[PDB]
Amino acid sequence: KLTPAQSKNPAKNELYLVEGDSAGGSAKQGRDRKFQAILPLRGKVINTAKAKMADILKNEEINTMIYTIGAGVGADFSIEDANYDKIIIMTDADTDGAHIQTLLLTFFYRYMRPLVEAGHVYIALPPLYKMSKGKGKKEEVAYAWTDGELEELRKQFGKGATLQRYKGLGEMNADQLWETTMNPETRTLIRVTIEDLARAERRVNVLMGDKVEPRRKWIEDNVKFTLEEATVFHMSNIQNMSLEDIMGERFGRYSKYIIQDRALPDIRDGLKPVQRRILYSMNKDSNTFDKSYRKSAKSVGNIMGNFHPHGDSSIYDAMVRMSQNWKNREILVEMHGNNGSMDGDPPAAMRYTEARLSEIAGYLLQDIEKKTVPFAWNFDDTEKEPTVLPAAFPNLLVNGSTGISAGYATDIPPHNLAEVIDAAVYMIDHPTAKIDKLMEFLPGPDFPTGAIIQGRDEIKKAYETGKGRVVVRSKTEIEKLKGGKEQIVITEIPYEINKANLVKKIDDVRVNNKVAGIAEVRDESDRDGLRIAIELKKDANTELVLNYLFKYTDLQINYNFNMVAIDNFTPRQVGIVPILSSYIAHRREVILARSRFDKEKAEKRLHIVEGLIRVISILDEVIALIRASENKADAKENLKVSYDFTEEQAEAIVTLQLYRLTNTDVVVLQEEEAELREKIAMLAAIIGDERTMYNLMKKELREVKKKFATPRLSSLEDTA
Amino acid sequence: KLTPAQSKNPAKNELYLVEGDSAGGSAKQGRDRKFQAILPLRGKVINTAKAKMADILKNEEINTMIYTIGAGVGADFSIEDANYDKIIIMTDADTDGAHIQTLLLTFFYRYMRPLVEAGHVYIALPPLYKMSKGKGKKEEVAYAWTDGELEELRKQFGKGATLQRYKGLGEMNADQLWETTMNPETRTLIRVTIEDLARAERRVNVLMGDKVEPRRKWIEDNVKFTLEEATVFHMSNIQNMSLEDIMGERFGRYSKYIIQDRALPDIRDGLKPVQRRILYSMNKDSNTFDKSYRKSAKSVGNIMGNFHPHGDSSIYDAMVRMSQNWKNREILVEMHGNNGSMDGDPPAAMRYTEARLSEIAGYLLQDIEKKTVPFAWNFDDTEKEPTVLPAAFPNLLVNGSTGISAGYATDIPPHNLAEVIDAAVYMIDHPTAKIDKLMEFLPGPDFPTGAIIQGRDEIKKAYETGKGRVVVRSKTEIEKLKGGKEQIVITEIPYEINKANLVKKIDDVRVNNKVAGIAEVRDESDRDGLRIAIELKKDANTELVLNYLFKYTDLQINYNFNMVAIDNFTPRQVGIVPILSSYIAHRREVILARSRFDKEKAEKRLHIVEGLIRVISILDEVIALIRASENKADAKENLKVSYDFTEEQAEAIVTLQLYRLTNTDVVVLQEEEAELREKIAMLAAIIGDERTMYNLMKKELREVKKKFATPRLSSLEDTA
DNA sequence: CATGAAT
DNA sequence: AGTCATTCATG
């Protein structure tokens, strides 16, 4: 891990703490090996304000930092044994970078404060952009750290130029990395000072302590979800910044991003950004259900390069999960090969597997081509991506979501498609509908793992408030055997539970003989179904055993609802009512936007058809006219002046291929006129009348339900 | 690793040896867990005929194989103690599958012979193809094992529904793996017998002993490089085959594949198949030098999805190598990021790096769009790929090639572009030119790492025969110091040598004081320069030290030429003359094919233009003609039949846009006729006259030389 | 012992 | 994101 400097010299030597090994390789290649040491970080550093102390000192990352600094730790910290004058934190300029800077600084504040206080801890600022007027002798190369140093740089030593947009240190090489962020002549750093020991203490504890509530509160008050962030103009050479304002600039940046753009679903389409990208990318590449499977590696690589600048494993894992019918109630990806099991064994690696969108996932994307949904630039401004999908079925409830953010988490269980549509259809007709009535249609969750759900009162509370605890209990049956004996047989288990770990834990009950009567525990499951068999001993009390298992193993668990999604850019704890009204409001924007799109298209076609019908009446004249003209533009002009065609009509006439003169059937063009007028009226009516629009919204939801509805799997029971 | 059956029963229990953990999972899912155990193989198994025995008995994979079978190791081998009645080798239906089958059967024949003799060792047989689709409720599934059975299977009173072509076990769901290869009632096996103890010991020692030359010789006589092999018409449940016939077909099929299709370069373009696929795929995706870099993962994924059905890592590694200017004399891929170093420190993973083709790589692909080169069906018959690139420069000698196959290896060093071209141009003019004259132009190799090459005679022998041993010696110089001291300074090192490992091995000489005089070894290399300093003690013998280091470290090495390439589908050991002559013959085919291509295109344009000019004269009749006609097709018919236009001409007229009738400038069309006629003459002359053709071949090679020539890097010296 | 496409 | 095994030919 550690690459040391050739020469000891505590007066000038530098320890580069580099985000990741790949970048650490770059830094090792680009350094001045005489006084610059490199310690790469294996990802996310332990939180030394949350974790215990058993853990802090068994952490390999932390120990080799202490070893190398060579000053001891904490209580016994000697500043002049330190082998470095500067400790330099050099991370990607992304938000996970800011999080890493955050976690280090908290370690140094707590266990190496003499070193922070004496201004020996810095942060390297790598460039966001590198401009290149390709060639121009060598390359004509300059760098830039703000939106504003970039605008400055559009002038300068050329125009019609290349602009690379840096997403990490890993995309930089040693000469680039040296010039811009490592060489003391040229580099810009920020030195970390303490301004108030009291104020900087309260900052570190609210952000990094195990108290969640103050953190969620800090985020509520400080983080502007709705607005941007001002560019923070770049200053030359070293500059000073409080531990207080660094920790809050960086952690706020992280928090906002992981809330809005990672771990939490959108309330409308129920997708995390990575899942939305998977679906969009795969659909744009025609990787649909109707067409052939396509190697996972190809899909993943296109997603990563076009939309999602992150690991191929994170993307592949997310893709695989969307194909697992014990995780998702209505799978969005079909995958050939080993996509895992309930025993949680590894899916085949992506070289092996192949994939495509499910039929139903087609319906989340339905009408995306008709400007139904806001798009934005991808990470490199090469390409647009949807911020939300059309969502012709209410995926959030149907498939649920489970995620862990900053200040917030979420748990939304899967639900029955038909039931969720039923509720939504009622609510379209009854905007003020209350829970009691909605639950006649949506009585509760419907896990793809089935089993028994207990706590009708608590479902109600979760559907009211977004929170509640419910009991999920495996489905069981007794069977008789040789010697009169019994065995408990398990056929459905609780959501999110590992079958093999459950079996093991039951077998440990047997072994430790916590309850009298267990003979043997066999998993007898196979490719066709789940079946765990708990063979009992001669005359053992079936009931006493079963009840011990439910109590003391995960044969029975509590599901805790915690229904948080993103609504108007803000995290938001929500019950069934805001969830369904948001969906409905969404489909309304979609159906109206789709209607406007198709209507504008029909109008243009109608104006042309009108034109073509007229041209046939004067075809001989139109052709002589075109022959008499000098060029295209002149022909169009003549057509307008002589015969009052529009620009649109004239352009269309003038670009007809000669063979089109073979079809001059005006009757057929008149049937098409009538059909277009009919259609424009229908579409106008939708845009003109909310109820006409809502009736369509319901018609479509019903079609979906008819096509994709499947029986409930989880049974419901009132008392818990 | 091992997943055991639930119930002991040496009568019918089965051990599945599956190729890969991913297929091992697939098998663990699809099994009958009562009697089928799963041992997954971590790829290529140790060769038991070659390895020591110290090394064999410490192989984790073998140890867990003898522990599980529970009988001991040949001699101590108690067949009556066996935990299984069938041992079933389950590998992919690819050539590396056949290789593993080969490697295990040597282990069993050699350390467990009673098992093989009793017919307790079986083979996988998984299906090559799967047929049909009725979609959600399908009743449309049928598996097939041969070419013959597929045609048979395409008949079915229904439609042409969809065909899947399996490439391994990774792509089969647990359901399909059971029905086809794991259920005893349905599956097909090969039982392995020893028909002749004598003939099966000759066959296993020829294929798997230390002796290469017998294996080479076996391959020469038995393996047909220019022919196919017509499938073994498939039988039912169990079938017997001798250990002699199995090892022979299995290893013959692997051997052939890795000679022709993996490890050995094509004599014309100098590329291994993976390199060609990288170049072609990247070029097809417009991932060229002139356009933006593009994420490596995206490149790799499309290579894997479209052309190369192998691991992402093997593809990235190959791709990365082509970017490294200390491995390739003229790099074929440009790569932003950590693409390694001379210290062999790992490159950034493909998630970080981004790449494109170099400019000169463009010259390998020059004129691929012009039917200059034979294409084949890719691996899943969905898309065509080139079997060889145009190669507008002689890449085989320029970038060389280093590979290991079966019976053969290759070692072709890099050469200087200008010099190879000079030799090639001379030989175009002098087909009979002999080595002494060619070496005036091409005196020897030019390593990208420079250094000093010693051995004119041996160069000559390599250039004559394909084989030769030369000395490659680091470039050194002696620098004076303070206080009566010298240091040796190394500035270039031998090709293929890891700088850090060399520095280490020199330092260990100091530490063990194997030779006296070394004060310190210091790698003083930076981003700009290679510089190693061996500082010597006051009054040490510097000649004695330097000579010790040359002899006993890699400060100097032997390079052994072993110039083997694929010539006409067969491996061939070749000197400079057959190498250069193959290149010139290839360029001839390319230039001729190109010229035909461009001429057919110019002739078509010309006929169309003749047609357009003629049309003017009959515009009114043409137009009237076109309105009368029933459709496009009919209109063309009348044009031909009435007016004696060709199909090409009629198609062009009938698709003119109406505004083209404004234009009556026959003169510009006539300038174009004339220019096309000139060009058709130039091109026909190239096709018609070998010297015209060869003179063009020379003109282009000189252009490439002028554009891309660089100075020699390695110096040459006559005395070893 | 290490080279480079493969498992 | 870095580790760890094997094949094959060769000196």
Next chain:
DNA sequence: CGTGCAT
């Protein structure tokens, strides 16, 4: 713990 997108 173990969940699931990230480093």
Next chain:
DNA sequence: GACTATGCACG
């Protein structure tokens, strides 16, 4: 191609 660490919130 498997294996190992971390953050974040929540029972």
